[PDB]
Structure formats: C-alpha cells, structure tokens
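yo

u said u wanted the structure for the complex thing, so here. seqs first:
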Amino acid sequence: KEEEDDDMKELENWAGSM
Amino acid sequence: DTHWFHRNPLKATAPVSFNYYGVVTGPSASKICNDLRSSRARLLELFTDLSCNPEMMKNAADSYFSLLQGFINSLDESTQESKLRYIQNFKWTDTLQGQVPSAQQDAVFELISMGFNVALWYTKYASRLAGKENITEDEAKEVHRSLKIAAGIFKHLKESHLPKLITPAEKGRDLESRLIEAYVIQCQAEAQEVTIARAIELKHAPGLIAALAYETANFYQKADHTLSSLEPAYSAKWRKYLHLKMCFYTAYAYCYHGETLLASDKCGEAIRSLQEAEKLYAKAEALCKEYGETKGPGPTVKPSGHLFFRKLGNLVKNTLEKCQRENGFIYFQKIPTEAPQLELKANYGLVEPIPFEFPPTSVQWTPETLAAFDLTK
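structre next:
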C-alpha cells in the first residue's frame, strides 16, 4: 500500500524550503 | 486557493526621542541617540507601509534592534547588563486592550514589545497575501514562511526575553506568557492551512490530508483553549475565529477520512464519516456568523463565502454523494450509529517555527561611546 509515506516527503520539501 | 486569517490590531507606541540632555556628553554618544531615534522611527513606519516586504522589515528591524541592544547587553561580561537599561521610558498599547496604553521604563520591555509588533507584521503580511484571489504559488509559500517566521519571533520573545521583565504583564496583555503562546500556536495552525491546500491541489493520498487537517484543527483548539482564561469581553471575537476554524478543519478531516474508508471497502463507515463532516461544517457555519455578530478587536468580517469556506462545502457534498452511490449498487453496507474516532498521530513537523534571535549588539556601541553617557545627573 504504502503510498502515503512517499507523498509525505513532497510536503516536507515544499515546507522545508524557505 | 485563498485564506482568511483574523488579525488583531498592531500595537502602537509613543515616539521616543532618545534625548538625555545634560547626561550625554560627546559627539559619539549623541550620534548613537540619533541613530536609535531614526532607526526606530523608520521601523515604526514600515508597520503601516503597504510597499513593505519581508526583506525591508528584517533590514529596518535589525538596524533598530542592533542599536537598541546597547541598552540591554553588556559589551564584555555575558553576566552583566548595560548601565543604560533603565535610562528610557517606553509606552505601548496592547492587542486586546484597544487604545489603553501600558508603560515600563525598561529597555527590555521595548525590545519585547517592538519585536512582538514585528512578529504581528509578519502575520499580517501573510494574511494579506493569503487573501489575493490571484495569489500565486510563490506567494502562498511566502504566506507559510512568514507565519513560521512570526511563530519563531513570538516564541523567542517568550522563552529568552519575557522572563527578564521585572514587572510581569497583567492578564490579557500582549507581553504575558499565556497570550503570547496562543499567537505562536495560531501561526502554526494558519501556516499549516497553506500546506493542506497544496497537498489537496497536488492530489496527495487522503490519509495524509486527513491527518494534517486534523492536526491543524487541534492547533486551533489549543489556541482557543490557551486564551480561555482571559476575560471573555475582549477575547470573545478572537476565540470565535479560532473555534470556527477548529470546527471547520475537523470537517476537513472527516471528509478526507471518509475517502480513506471508502477506498477500503468500508463504505458504510465512509458514509457515516461524511455525515459527521456535514455536522462539523454546520457548526462552523454557525460559529462564523457569531463571529460576525461578536464585538472585539479588528475589522468586522462575515466568513461564509471565502473561497476556502465554500470549497469544503462542495467537497463534502460530492464526497458524501459518491459514498452513498457506491453503497447503493456496490457495498450495500449499514450506516454505523456513532461517528468514527480520529487517529491523532504525533506531530508532522511541517509546521515547525523558524528559530529567531535578535541581531548582535551593533558595533557602533563601544566602551568609549557608552562612557559618554550618564556621568550622574
């Protein structure tokens, strides 16, 4: 299943930018 | 793609001259007073300046705080403090107190009070961007960043500076521990709002969205609660905003949670989840009206139509109808009696406030310049 984890990153990168 | 963030008024302060008359003796001590006076004035002007951006604020703020820092920090001993700490009286209004000012003759009081206004400015810069119908991607990110910057300033003020104040703040005042904590929390919730919108627009898994939404609601609840020991009179408007947003985002959680259940062939449960979403949304729909009828700080607003408020409404109906349709030809499942309970996972950290520190004491402060003060009158 496991997709949820993969996505979580894309936010962390968007947020952890500025 | 837009957000509505309730904002209380900025704090206002008495202009401060930094004129010590016979005390100051010398070209150098006089210059530092003018530089303090003018850097302060320029900073204050930015708070109401519409062309101001985050860069200007930081630039003007550092300029002032670095000079102001000469009234607080010792130049050599980290255990000592400027002899000038008490030389100047500073006078400030408070966010819930209207025009009723409060004054302390303490340079530490000024540093915290002005810093607090810098933080508010960032929350207001964020909320202005969030309201543009045309808001771009970069602007949304800036909204998020600005709120995180604000969170970190408020928090820094609270942890490392508030405890220096020899006169504690009275209940309800901006420099009090409990109130200042609510601003930190609100900023996190508001910033997390932007994150959720990107995740939704970006089509992320419903489990993540539901969880993030739920945590957002929880933050709003904690802020609401944090303020709850305040006099109801002047907190009532603000708490209505927080509570409305809390209910509103819980609906978001139930809505996306329904998708998770439906995707799991638990459609009966999914329908029940969406029904709770309708309820939470209606509660929010009720609270947002009370806010518009509730007197208190900031302009009057009537939250219903915000593009944000209506989207969840359309999402709930369409998501609900989808479930029942599946149920009618596919699942044939019972609708559970009790609403589902929410996960409550641990923090996702997407909301971490950006750490703040004031700049170092300006290099204009030297022992010679400092020596040109007091002299005892």
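Residues 1-377 of chain B form a domain with the Serine Threonine Protein Phosphatase 5, Tetratricopeptide repeat fold (CATH 1.25.40.280). Chain B has one domain: 1-377.
cya
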